[PDB]
Every structure is written in structure tokens, then in C-alpha cells.
Design a protein around this ligand. Structure first.
Ligand SMILES: *[C@@H]1O[C@H](CO)[C@@H](O[C@@H]2O[C@H](CO)[C@@H](O)[C@H](O)[C@H]2NC(C)=O)[C@H](O)[C@H]1NC(C)=O
Ligand SMILES: *[C@@H]1O[C@H](CO)[C@@H](O[C@@H]2O[C@H](CO)[C@@H](O)[C@H](O)[C@H]2NC(C)=O)[C@H](O)[C@H]1NC(C)=O
Ligand code: SY9
Ligand code: SY9
Ligand code: SY9
Ligand code: SY9
Ligand code: SY9
Ligand code: NAG
Ligand code: NAG
Ligand code: NAG
Lengths: 339, 339, 339, 336, 331
């Protein structure tokens, strides 16, 4: 008769008040938290948040519930009866959205042990805020957090602490479409301070390194191929007008359809992303490679025997300068965005 | 037994009626309001609103709840019992939608003190309407508000008032993907006047300043360069049929593959914006420079000396007209939108 | 004790029943409606609906709630006990979805007066269906409505009625991203006749004038410019292959990149809009101008005396005919879609 | 006091049990169903479904509720008391999600008549699944159904039935952005069979005919025009002919990628897709045809320029002939 | 009076308690599950999941509910009274989202038979995280699962089992916009092991092959035709500048518009797909054919020497890469 033994511990004749905490008069209650992340995803930068599906598990002691007389060494309080026992008011500080699960039954479990220790396993969906900076897109790396805090109880009455062993665990094979969730999860404190008191808070931080593979092959490399076709105009005489104009116009026009083609499938933000610079710089090196040939024609238009040497002087310079100047920019870009 | 002493104040024996307000006979209830914004964003012109996540603290006095004999200086009421006390009918006048949070327990707190003061903290999500004007895009600024009004109670019975120090606070590091949330939050009244009565209302106003970075680098700067290349056609003589046509075709064609490219990420509004003008004006100047050469070539079609003077005049005029015409427009443009 | 006096009118020893309507014996209950519109937007051609946030104020007489003995001249029933009083089965006929607002408290009010009148104010979100025809887009106009109907009472027992003074009001400074909301609101009856009886229904019509600007500057104008550039090829001699060909190519290619450029931002429907004609006609005029050169070159190919005369005669007509034809089309078009 | 006379028929002393059906021992309960569609829309092939807004109206007989002593010849059960009377366990078999409506009051009605008939009108939003095949897009036509089945009662205890006169009506002036809802709906029976019994089920079938107008004017016709300029290019004019061949290919490839953004998301081939791929050949091969001419006429002699006159003369009456053969095939297949 | 007999079995006087399981003293409760699927859909790499619609059916034995005295040999408990009977604490381990149905009545059914057997059928909407690798688009294949685990009960007290006959059925006619539901579903155990115990879990594997039709006609073939135009320029002599220059420029400019025309109808992932390699390889082959002519014009014996090689090598080198490609992405 375990269900029956419980309402002797919880009921009218027991004298249990779930509105009152354990050790009411004396020291604080110690709640040992740990989670399991079964699902991690929907990281959006427009709403600046991410969704996670977890099992939260709180463990604590309530000496009001300790027993001995009964043979079975642990009792399972029914989900519907959960009001009838005190439990901590842990909430997620940075939660935007939240809900419990109730299919097929309530996804909640409570075990009170013989020594009074309680075990509370509960399954949640959680939308949490993660302020995001795309400055270095697409070589950026984000840091999302998750704060377990007490709502009304202070440090004088309630204290949260992580598990010593694997407090935060993540399901095997979980994938994100754009980031990689890293294996390191930094645990730390966030104990808040207000003029209304001091409140317990424990934190876990996830790290999210973005992937480039797509932008590398479908944007950086093709733009590099076009900037290489900009330089071959230099290795032709001034007399061949059709080639150097057509190439220059192609190179410019092709680079322009590429920089516009990309824009529709990039994160829509107001500030300058690292990718936005690459497109701009690549446009100069295509633009000026056409503007170079215009400067050659303006000097070598007057077909004097002397200045054709000094006009071909521009071309001999550019043959070494444009490849070098590009490589000086290139070496800056990848060193800065892979420091 | 603080929870038991509490329901001596609330219970049938007390004679407390939660439908009735404090000081029901005479003067109005003074309610002191303040908020902490933990999340700000989802600012959308499409639905013309924004989304916030807040704490809302409310402090008033109830002389019925005051007590003395009991030791503990403040009693807190359970979140399941809130309806047994009176509380103010505060609602957000420009709420498109709202709700509470109840994970893991109800995110609500109430403290009633020995003196009779009641402190009521509530966590909330609100979607509030923010009528927006994008006439000056992307050099616009917006002003989203937030009104705390009383529903049923008039000025005679209820008054809402902000805190003196730091009434409306905002969490650290809350980035937005487009706007910048300014430090200045203005505080005023919105007391409503209907035939049915006067109604207390307080208001806090935010200021949002849109960033340009991306549009400056992907639109303005690139377009500026394509318009200058349009002018160099003037500096070539009439004989160079390939060059002058090649530039005119490239410039227009390149200007067009930028305008279509930029449309992708423009805000969804069916009216004219600052950005749209610029793009249309830059089209005219690129189009008409090619149209000018058509008028030059048409005049010198007649190969006599009278007409070659007429056609030589057009270019030499155009060399110092287009750059003046542009500058005069450019001066207007940037002066108007950065007044 | 105004709370206590109410439940003397409603409670056990009163004999009042909420299920029964006022004047149950004979004549119908005249309900007086009026709304205030705080929010208006989310107009979609995909879901073919719109979203409004409103107050709704119903007013009727219940002689059963008449009193005098009690000092105060009006009582307010609590939002929780609205079930204990009769109120009209008013529902919105074209509602797709709707909700009450209950933050921070239930956003409802109900006064019962000394003479037995009622005043029921209620805040509501409504998604209403609005069939929309985009045949003339973007020079179209839509007329969304809003019907207040009784669910189960006929005109014999229940009649709805608008107010005489400002029965429908819209908040100051609301804005829509695509449409303009006109100040005129047509009021009328929608009384429904079924085989089960005749039911009360009252309707308010809003009219929406779609905004043009963006499509004018970003699509109509550029398309016009590209048509003008098609005509400049008539002002070069038949000889110049590079120019006359390259113009025709640019114009046709450029024109096409815009029609598809616009597609991504147009309201996605399967039928022909007015803008879709424009782009298609503009395509003909650009295509046929290139086609005209092909005929000219086709004729004068056999370069004798008679052929080059008849070939040159085409271009001379084309300089007049094409702009004339376009102007005739253009006058018809804009006169038809702005009759 | 009609309210009070009702709870005389329902209350403790009446011996009414809402959990037990009418005609409990004997014959099957006959329920006549009919719907009024106020909204029909949100038809998506991504989630593969559509969204309706309807008035369901169920009529059955309950001899336990028949009366006579009361003057009023029909009694209205309040929506709050709906638990207190037996009513059918109707459910929409192909519903992905539904809900009720409750603004301002509960959007429900019940009427029990003097003779025992019950009349239960209710208001719903349904999201019904509609499998959708886009092989012939945009010349396709879809069929979306709606099944009203009994959850737990079998053919022996419960049978569903459409009204004889106009059981499924649709509201005046309802527009869809892509489809046209056809006037003729069909009615039939979906009566299900399992090991656990035979369950009544009635069904209505809507037909949805997609519109082409837009795709005709801004896609099909243009592609026909560029295919014409592939034929006008039909020796010496090297800058012109090759430019006409090149332009067609450029202007075609911009039209192909131009549409892709607007088209529906499906990984299989559509009719629209074939057209563009076919029209890409007829343009691509026109330029490819002149590369055979320029390869043969490159050797400037008597026999080479005569052989290079044979190619352009055939293509003036072969490409138009070949296209027209394919064209007639295409349109006759996608409009039988 | 079957409704009045039930609350004799369940009610106060019986001493039945739904908080306690059948065979509480000793051996496990054997539940036998099975599902009908009326909707597999909303597969989404962005959220990394699909939303399914099902009937679930659980059958077990409860000897506290056995009877014989009553004539009718099976009783139907009302959906409203489902609290007052024990039933398994089944949950889907890989649910992100799920819900019951309430229209028009509660879509649930419970029969208790003469021999204490309970038969519980319930209608549900789920959403099940399906981690998808997309590295071989659009020749990829994806194995979505669905786990039915016991929340609180171990293997000592509760065991799930699929039906022996047609445990997982799928409704006729269903279609997907991008994939196929492969006929063969797998079944297996997932039984979880923890430090708190060993929990019963049964699972079904749906396989889904993605379709290539759209990308074949609108991408792979048009990319091939452009690469064929890259080879015709070789056959032209070194003299013809406009012809060979116009080809390369057309070939490049055409290949750029297709490769950007695809971007719109590709899935939202940051990593390299197989489609991307093909687009990037078909750039090189166009790009280099133009770059070859630059070496020919930058160099009459050696200038005509390069053209004769690239008529054979480029169609071959392509064919060599191509063979690897389709063999690696169709092993
Ligand atoms: C419900 O419908 C069935 C079928 O129409 C009815 O059963 C018939 O009853 C008539 C007389 O009422 C007989 O003549 C037929 O032979 C019956 N046919 C069948 C197939 O049963 C039934 O009576 C109807 N009404 C109820 C149950 O009240
Ligand atoms: C439920 O399932 C298992 C396997 O069918 C049964 O387990 C057997 O239980 C009996 C009686 O306690 C033991 O003697 C056997 O050794 C068990 N065999 C096993 C585990 O392989 C169980 O009895 C079944 N039915 C019940 C408990 O009603
Ligand atoms: O009076 C307050 C306002 C302040 O609001 C910001 C959020 C806070 C987080 N928790 C939520 C409830 C609160 C609290 C607890 C006990 C008495 C007063 C009280 N609050 C908030 C407070 C902080 C700290 C604490
Ligand atoms: O009679 C009214 C209608 C009017 O509706 C718009 C909104 C208003 C804001 N609050 C909400 C309830 C209301 C009010 C209070 C007491 C008696 C009548 C009454 N109302 C609304 C009124 C205003 C003012 C007030
Ligand atoms: O019998 C009916 C069905 C019919 O269905 C379409 C909608 C209607 C709108 N209201 C809702 C309830 C209804 C009504 C009132 C009283 C008795 C029967 C009854 N109904 C519906 C009816 C119409 C009219 C009315
Ligand atoms: O045992 C079952 C499983 C089967 O599942 C598919 C759907 C069905 C539709 N309704 C829902 C409940 C059901 C039923 C009724 C009475 C006893 C058992 C039972 N069910 C399901 C059944 C079919 C038929 C019926
Ligand atoms: O203590 C725990 C935490 C752990 O959480 C991950 C999920 C699990 C699946 N079910 C859910 C409840 C749980 C369980 C049952 C009985 C005592 C403790 C307990 N739990 C979770 C546990 C595993 C196993 C089991
Ligand atoms: C709980 O909290 C602290 C930290 O370990 C400690 O002082 C105290 O003894 C702990 N144990 C209790 C209250 O039982
Ligand atoms: C509340 O404020 C008003 C005005 O500030 C004042 O008249 C009143 O006395 C104050 N205090 C109360 C009503 O307790
Ligand atoms: C309601 O209006 C009707 C129509 O004018 C009138 O006949 C009736 O007397 C009015 N008042 C009632 C029924 O109380």
C-alpha cells in the first residue's frame, strides 16, 4: 500500500505544508541540478534565440518526508499530487518560451527516498535568448547560455549547484544545419544581486562554431576565379581592343551578378559582415583592372613612339602588383578572421 | 506557520473581499510601477510591432492586510492563492498579444508587509504594436512605446506611477539584427479621456536608430563608382565608337544588376523610401550619359564642320554638367536625411 | 458591500437564471454595439485575411437586474462570475480565429445599472477573412468587412444595432506597409435568412487603397528607361553593327532580368495582374525593336540602290511609330487602371 | 422555465445516462450530417494539406428526450451542459489539426425537439490532409477530401448520412490565390473495415483547378519569342549571327533561373520544367548548328561553301517543324 | 447498465487504485503496441525533424478489472473517466512536439474485457527530431526513427512489445514533396540503460530516399550542355578571336547564372553538398577552357599544339571525374 502510505506523509494528519520549505527556520536547501539535451536547434538571428528540448533533474532533501517503518525503500508520488509537496521554484532566467510535456501521461516523476531525499525528473521544451554578433560572418562563433535561477527564494533559503559528474549531457548524433555544437560546455555561476536580495543561479555555456564549406565553394572560390581572369588582360598588347574590353566587361559584370546572387541567401542584417568586405574588395580588383586598361588607352591613344613604352610600363607594373596587392589583402583577411 | 497566519487575513473570518479595492470609500490607490527588459526584438514592419520579455513590479498599499502580532516582518502569498487578494487591473494598452510564464513553477511573486504594502512581481511576454514609418530608409529612426493603463478603475480610485530611480531597465548586451536600441528612455503620461471617465495611464518610449553599414558598402559606395565611370565617356572623342558604347552599355547593365540585387533585402513596404530614390536617380545619370552620346553621334552624323562643332560642344559641356548636377542632388540627399 | 448586493440579484434566493434571455415572454432584446480598433494589419493574399485588435462594447437592458434600495447607482460584476449573467451570443461571422485578453487580469468589464441596463466591454484579437482580387495590382482596391451576428437567437428575440455616434473608431497614427486605410466606414445590415429562421447581423466595411510608389520607382520607371534605350538604335545608321546589335542585346537581356527580379517581391498568385501586362508589353516593345533591325539588315543585306532606300525607310518610321504606339498603349493602360 | 423543464429530462430522477446511446438494445443510431464552408484556403504542398472553416450540423433521434406536456415545441440545451446528453463521437479522419470557437460565447448549439430529434450545430476550424501530385504543374488539378467517421461506435450501433438536399455548401465569393474551387463536389462513403469492426464514414470531395494566366504571360510566351529569334539567325554575318545565337542562350538562361524562385518546392519533374529544358535545347542547338556551318565554311573554297549552304536551308524548315511536333504533343498531353 | 457496473469495479467501494500497476507484487506488465500512420510530413532540415500523425494502440492485462457476473462481455470506459484506471506511462523519446485531439469528442477509446484485458486506442500528432546529414544532396537518404519509451517504470515492472502482425501501418496515398517513404520499416528495441535502471523502449525505422528529377533536368543536364560548348571553341582556329572569345564569355556567363539560379531552391545548410561540388567542378571546366585559349593566344606551332590536345583531354578528364562522382554517389 505505497500510494496509501504517502497520504499519511503528506495529508491532513501528517501536518505537511508544501507552501513552507524544508528546514524553514534553519540553513538553506541545496538543490543539485543536471540536464540531458535530447534536442538542440532552431538558432535564429532574426529573433536572436535558440530552442532546446531537455530533461531537467532536481535532487534535494526534505527531512519532513523521511520514513523507515515501510519496507519499500523509495516511494513514487503521482504527477497529479505534485502540489502536495514542496519543490524548488527554479526557472530559466533567459527563457523566452517554455512548456512541460503531457503525452501520453504527464512527463513528470517524483521519488521520495527513505532518508527524505527527493528526486524530481521533468521533461521540457525551452526557447532561450542568445544575443548574436555576425560581424565575422561566416567565420563567426557564438556563445549561447542557459541560466537556472531561483524566482523568490534567496541564497539564505535556497542554493542551486550542478552535478559533479556529467551535469550537462547531449544526445549522440545531434546535428545543426549551420553551426557545430562543441563538446566543451563551460559551467559557472550567475548569482544575481538586487536591492531586494541575493539570488542563486547556475549557468552552462554552449559554443557554436559556424561552418563555411558552402560559402567557400559557392562564393569565395568562384569570386577568386573571376579575379584571376581580371589579371590576364594585363598579359596582352594595347592594340587588342576586343579582348581586353570584353574580358574586363565580363569580369565586372560576372562579379556583379555574383555579389547580388549571394545577397538573397545571407543573414539579413544592417551592419557590415566579413563576407560583405570580400565581395566589395573583389569588386575593386575587377573594377580597377578595367580602369587600368582605360588609363593605358588614354596615354597610348596619341600613338607616339616614345610613350608606348611608358604606357606599357603600367601593364608591366600591374602584372606583378595586382597579384601581390591581392595577396597582401588576402593574408590580412584570413589572419584577422582566423586569429 | 506563516501560510496559516496568512489565511487568517484572507479567510472567511477576516471579512476581506478581493472584489473591493483598498480605501474603497475615499482616496485613490497609488501604484508604483517599474520594469526590467530581459529581451527586446522581433521588430517587424510586416506586422508593425515588436516583442519584449519583461519583469513587471507593482507596489501599492492595502490597510486591510497590515498585521503586527506575527514575528516575521513580511509574508508572501502562494501563486495559487493570488485571486483571494485584490490587485490592480493593469493592462498594456498597445498589447497585440501577451501571457505569463509558469515553468517550472508559476513565475509570480507577492509580498504583503507589516505596514500593509503589497509588492507584486510578475514575469511577462508582450507583443506591442509600434506603427512605423520607413520613408527615410535606411536612415530612419523609430519610436516604439509601452503604455501601462488601468482597465476598469478611473483616476478617482486608481493611479499608476513610475519609480523615481531607474524605472525602466534593460539587460546587458541585447543586440538587434538591424536597429540600435538607444540609452535614452523617455517617461510620460497617457491619461485617457472617454465619455465613460478619466483613466490612469503611464508610458515609456524607446528610440531605435537603424544602421547603414551594409547598404553603404553594398549599394551606395558601389553605385557612386559606376556613375563616375559614366562621365569618362565624355572625355573620349567621337571617333571611338567601341569604347564609348562599351562603357555606356556596361555602366547601365552593371547598375541594373545591382538594383535587382539589393531589392532582395529591402523592407516589405509598397511606398517610396530614401534608398529607392537614390537608386532611381543613379539610374537616370547612367542612362542619360549613354543617351547624350546618342545625341552627339546623331549630330556629327552630318560630317560637315558646322555639326562637328555642335557635337564637340555637347561633350565638353557634359564634362562639367553631369558632375555638378549629381553633386547638387547629392548635397540635397544627404542633407535631407541627415538633418 | 457592492460585491454582496450583486449576488443577492444573481444568487440562490434571487431566482435569476443566466440560460434565459431578458423579456423571455415577448419582445426582442435590442443590443447596441460599438468597437474601437487599436490595431489593424497582417493583411495577406496567401491566407486571404486580416488581423484586428479591438474593444467591443455591448449594451442592452435586463429588467431582472433592476434595483433602487442600494445607495450606489451602478454595480460592477467581477470578470470571474460572468457566467452567472445572461449576455448575447454575439459571434463574428467571418472570424477565422480569435481570443480574449487576460493579462495581467481578465480584460473584461460589466456594469449593471440602477434602471437595469448593461454595459459589457471586452478586448479581443480577431483574424477575419477578406477575399481579395489582385487583378489590377498594384492599382487595386480591397474592401474588407466585419460582421457581428447572433449564434442561436433570431430577430424575434435578439436584434443587434450600431451606435449613432462614432460606432467604429480607429486609433491615431496606425499605418499599413502596403495599403492605406480610408476614413470612410460603410455601415449596413447583413441579416441572414436560413431555413431555420432569420438572424440578426450588423456589418462594417473598410476600404483599402494599395500604395503604388515602390512599384512605380523600382519597376515601372526602370522598365520605361529600358524601352527608351531600345529606341536609340533607330538613331544610328544600318552600318554600325556593334552598337545597334549591342543595344538590342542589352535592352532585351536587361529587361528580362527585371521582370524576374520583380517576381520575388510580387504577391504570388496564379492569375494575371496589371503589372504583369506592363512587363509583358514592355518586353514586346523591346523585343520588336531588335526584331526591326533584323528586318532592316535582312533587306539591305543585298546592298543595291533600291534595297538600302527601303531599309532606311523603316528606321525613319520607327522613330515615330514606336513612341506613338507606346504612348497609345500607355494612355489606355493608366486610364483603364485609374478610370 | 424551459431551462428547468430540460433538467427535468436530464436530472437525477430522469434516469438519463449520457454515456449510453439512443436505442441501446435495438437498432443503429442514424445521424444526418451537413456542412457550411465559410472559408477554404491555406492550400500548401509543403505540409500537404488545406485549412477549412465550417459549420458542422448533426441531426439524430433520441427517444429518451421526447416530450409533450411542455408548450414550447423545442428545447435549447446550453453549451455548458453538453456533457449531460449523449451525442455522436464524430471525428475527421484526415484532420491534421482542428479546434472549436469560443468568442464571445461558446459557438455551439443544441436543440431537442418534442418528438425526440436532436439538432447539434457547431463551428470548427479544420486542417485536413490532402495528398497533392504536381507532375502536371501548372496545368494540374487536385482533389481534396473530407471524411466524417465514428471514432468508437460500429455500423451496428451508429450510421452516418449526408442530407439529401445540398449537404455541402460553400460561401459566396471565396477566392483562392492559385486554385479555383470547382462547384461540383462529390459525396460517397468511406466506411472503414478493421479486425475490431466496421465503422461508418461519409466523405465529400472537392476539386481544385490551378490557374496558368501568370505562367502563360510571364514565362511560356516569352520563351516562345526567344525561340523565334533562334530561327531568324538563319553565312558571312559573323558578329550578327553569333550574337543572335548567343543572346537567345543568355536570355533563355536568365528566364530559367528567373522562374526557379517563384516555383513550388518539389524534388521531382514538373510540366513547366520540361518546357524550359526543351526550349533550352531548341535555343542551345541553334547556336550549335552554326558551329557546324563555321567549321565547314572555315575552309574557304567551292565545295565547302556549297556544303555550308545545306545546313541553314534545312533548319529554316526543320527546327520550326520539330518544335511544333513537340508543342502539339506537350499541350495535348497536359490538356486531354 | 454497463456504465453503472464500471464504477462498481473502479469506485470507492472496490478499493481499486490507478496509482498502482497490475501485478504490483511481482512480474512485469506486458504491453503490446501498434500504430496507424495517417500523415508523415513536414520534413525540415532547418528544424531537423518531421511531424507525424498517428493512431496508437496499447493492449495489456489488469486482473483487478476481470469479471463475469455482467452479461455484456466488454465494457467501454468513458474518455472523461480515464484517470480512474491505471495505464502505461508511455512517451515518445524523440518527441519535440506532440498533442491529443478533442474534435468533436475526445479522440480516445478504452475497453476493459471480461478477462481483465484493457485495450487503449488514442489519436495523436507528433514531432520527432530526425538528425539529417545532407552531405550527398540530392542523392541522399535519411533514416528517421520513433521511440516509445516508458517514463518511470523499469523492465522489472513494465515491458513494451510490437504486435506480431502489422505493428506499424501507413495509410494509402500519402506523398512527400521531396522524398519517398520506403516501404520497408524496421523494428527494434532501444532499451535504455541508466544508473537509475533499465527502461523499456521499442522503435521503428522509416527510410526516406530523396528524389533527383528537378535537379537533374534543371541543373545537372544544363550544366553538361554548357560544358559541351566549352569544347567547341577548341575546334576553331587561333585566328578567329571574336568566335572563341564570345564562346568562353558566353560559357562562363551562362554557368554563373545557373549556379546562382540554383541557390534559391537549395536547402539551408552551411557545409558542402554533392550538388555544390558538381557546380564548382563545372566552373573549372568552363573557366579553364577559356584560360586555355589565353595560353594559345599568349603563344603558331605551339599555339596550334595546345588546341589538338584539349579536344581529347577535356572530354576525358571530365568523364574521369564524372565516373568517380556518380559511382561515389550511387555505390
Ligand atoms: C436507421 O436506418 C436504418 C436504415 O434505413 C433503418 O433500418 C430499416 O428500417 C426500416 C423500417 O424503419 C425497415 O423496413 C428496413 O428493412 C430497415 N433496414 C435496415 C438495413 O435495417 C432504421 O430503422 C433507421 N432508424 C432507426 C434505427 O431509428
Ligand atoms: C510478461 O512477460 C514475461 C515474458 O513473456 C513473463 O515473464 C515470466 O514470468 C513468469 C512468472 O513470473 C516466470 O516464471 C518466468 O520465468 C518469466 N519468463 C521470462 C521473463 O522470460 C511474464 O510472466 C509475462 N506476463 C505476466 C507477468 O503477466
Ligand atoms: O521586487 C522585485 C523586482 C525585481 O525584478 C527583477 C527580477 C528579479 C528576479 N527575482 C524575481 C522576483 C524578485 C523578488 C523576490 C523577492 C522579493 C522581491 C522581488 N522582486 C524581483 C526582483 C529581482 C529578484 C527576484
Ligand atoms: O464603455 C467603455 C468603452 C471604452 O472602450 C475602450 C477602452 C477603454 C479602456 N477602459 C477599458 C474599459 C473601459 C471602461 C471602464 C468603466 C466603464 C466603462 C468602460 N468602457 C471602456 C472604455 C475605455 C475606458 C475603459
Ligand atoms: O441548424 C442549423 C444549421 C445552420 O448552419 C449554418 C449556420 C447558421 C448560423 N447560426 C448558427 C446556429 C444556427 C441555428 C440556430 C438555431 C437553430 C438551428 C441553427 N442552425 C444554425 C444554422 C444557421 C443559423 C444559426
Ligand atoms: O483497436 C483499435 C485500433 C484501430 O486503429 C485505427 C483506427 C481505427 C478508428 N477507430 C478508432 C478506435 C478504433 C476502435 C474502436 C473500438 C475498439 C477498438 C478500436 N481500435 C481503433 C481501430 C480503428 C477503428 C476504431
Ligand atoms: O534521475 C533520473 C534522470 C534521468 O533523466 C533522463 C531520462 C531518463 C528516462 N526516464 C525518465 C525518468 C527517469 C527516472 C526514473 C526513475 C528514477 C529516476 C529517473 N530519472 C530519469 C532518468 C532516465 C531514466 C528515467
Ligand atoms: C547545504 O548547503 C551548504 C553547502 O554545502 C552547507 O553549509 C550545508 O551544511 C548543506 N547541507 C544541509 C543544509 O543539509
Ligand atoms: C495617493 O496619492 C494621492 C495624490 O498623490 C493622494 O491624494 C493620496 O492621499 C495618496 N495616498 C493614499 C490614497 O493612500
Ligand atoms: C427594441 O426595438 C424594437 C424595434 O424598434 C422595438 O419595437 C422594441 O419595442 C424595442 N425595445 C424593446 C423590445 O425593449
Amino acid at each position: 500500500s505505497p500510494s496509501d502510505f504517502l497520504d499519511k506523509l503528506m495529508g491532513r494528519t501528517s501536518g505537511y505544508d508544501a507552501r513552507i520549505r524544508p528546514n524553514f527556520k534553519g540553513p538553506p536547501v541545496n538543490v543539485t541540478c543536471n540536464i540531458f539535451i535530447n534536442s538542440f536547434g532552431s538558432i535564429a538571428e532574426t529573433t536572436m534565440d535558440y530552442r532546446v528540448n531537455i530533461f531537467l533533474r532536481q535532487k534535494w532533501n526534505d527531512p519532513r518526508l523521511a520514513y523507515s517503518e515501510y519496507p519499500d525503500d523509495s516511494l513514487d508520488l503521482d504527477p497529479s499530487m505534485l502540489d502536495s509537496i514542496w519543490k524548488p521554484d527554479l526557472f530559466f532566467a533567459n527563457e523566452k518560451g517554455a512548456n512541460f510535456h503531457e503525452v501520453t501521461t504527464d512527463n513528470k516523476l517524483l521519488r521520495i527516498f527513505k532518508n527524505g531525499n527527493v528526486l524530481y525528473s521533468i521533461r521540457l521544451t525551452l526557447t532561450l535568448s542568445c544575443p548574436m554578433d555576425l560581424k565575422n560572418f561566416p567565420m563567426d562563433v557564438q556563445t549561447c547560455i542557459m541560466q537556472l535561477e531561483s524566482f523568490g527564494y534567496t541564497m539564505n533559503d535556497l542554493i542551486f549547484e550542478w552535478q559533479d559528474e556529467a551535469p550537462v549531457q547531449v544526445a549522440e548524433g545531434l546535428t545543426l544545419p549551420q553551426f557545430l555544437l562543441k563538446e566543451e560546455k563551460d559551467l559557472r555561476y550567475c548569482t544575481k544581486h538586487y536591492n531586494t536580495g541575493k539570488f542563486t543561479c547556475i549557468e552552462v555555456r554552449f559554443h557554436l562554431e559556424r561552418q563555411m564549406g558552402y560559402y567557400l565553394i559557392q562564393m569565395y572560390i568562384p569570386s577568386l576565379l573571376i579575379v584571376i581572369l581580371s589579371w590576364v588582360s594585363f598579359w596582352i598588347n594595347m592594340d587588342a581592343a576586343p579582348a581586353r574590353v570584353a574580358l574586363g566587361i565580363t569580369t565586372v559584370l560576372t562579379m556583379t551578378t555574383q555579389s547580388s546572387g549571394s545577397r538573397a541567401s545571407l543573414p539579413k542584417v544592417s551592419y557590415v559582415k566579413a563576407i560583405d568586405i570580400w565581395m566589395a574588395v573583389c569588386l575593386l580588383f575587377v573594377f580597377s583592372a578595367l580602369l587600368e586598361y582605360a588609363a593605358v588607352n588614354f596615354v597610348s591613344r596619341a600613338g607616339t613612339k616614345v610613350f608606348i613604352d611608358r604606357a606599357k610600363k603600367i601593364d608591366t607594373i600591374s602584372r606583378a602588383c595586382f597579384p601581390l596587392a591581392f595577396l597582401i589583402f588576402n593574408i590580412f583577411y584570413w589572419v584577422i578572421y582566423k586569429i
